[PDB]
């Protein structure tokens, strides 16, 4: 479907003849189509589309419910592969993060040791 302009917006033309958008409610103007927020990626890493990738299929079993077929690998599974992707993507980063924290924690420690050790000597 083609979205219509939200309530109380207006198109206008520049001298140039370019289109811009008048938002009367807020007494503002813009080069940006307001419905672009729904139809445009919001980042060079964003995709609006959540299509299953080539070879995957949605399926419904009356006993078991929704499930997914992977024709690439002659496989079926319950879990949305998209969801499991995002999960194990995140789990990858979330512990890649935690090792870096472990690293600094140690290296900060290895120099705190050179001081703390020199300290106990006085206690003699």
């Amino acid at each position: 479907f083609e979205l219509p302009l939200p309530e109380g917006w207006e198109e206008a033309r520049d001298f140039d003849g370019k289109v811009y958008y008048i938002d009367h409610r807020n007494r503002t103007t813009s080069w940006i189509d307001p419905r672009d927020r729904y139809t445009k990626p919001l980042t060079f890493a964003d995709c609006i589309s959540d299509e299953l990738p080539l070879g995957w299929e949605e399926a419904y079993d009356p006993q078991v419910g929704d499930y997914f077929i992977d024709h690439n690998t002659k496989t079926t599974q319950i879990e949305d592969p998209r969801v499991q992707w995002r999960r194990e993507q995140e789990h990858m980063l979330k512990d890649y993060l935690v090792v870096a924290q472990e690293a600094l924690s140690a290296q900060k420690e290895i120099y705190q040791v050179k001081q703390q050790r020199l300290e106990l000597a006085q206690q003699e």
Binding site: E10, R13, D14, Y20, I22, R27, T28, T29, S30, W31
Partner: peptide
């Protein structure tokens, strides 16, 4: 080369071709 400089749209207060 050099790109054309940024142009803002006509400000709200003022005349508009609609």
């Amino acid at each position: 080369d050099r790109p054309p400089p940024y142009v803002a749209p006509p400000s709200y207060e003022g005349p508009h071709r609609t």
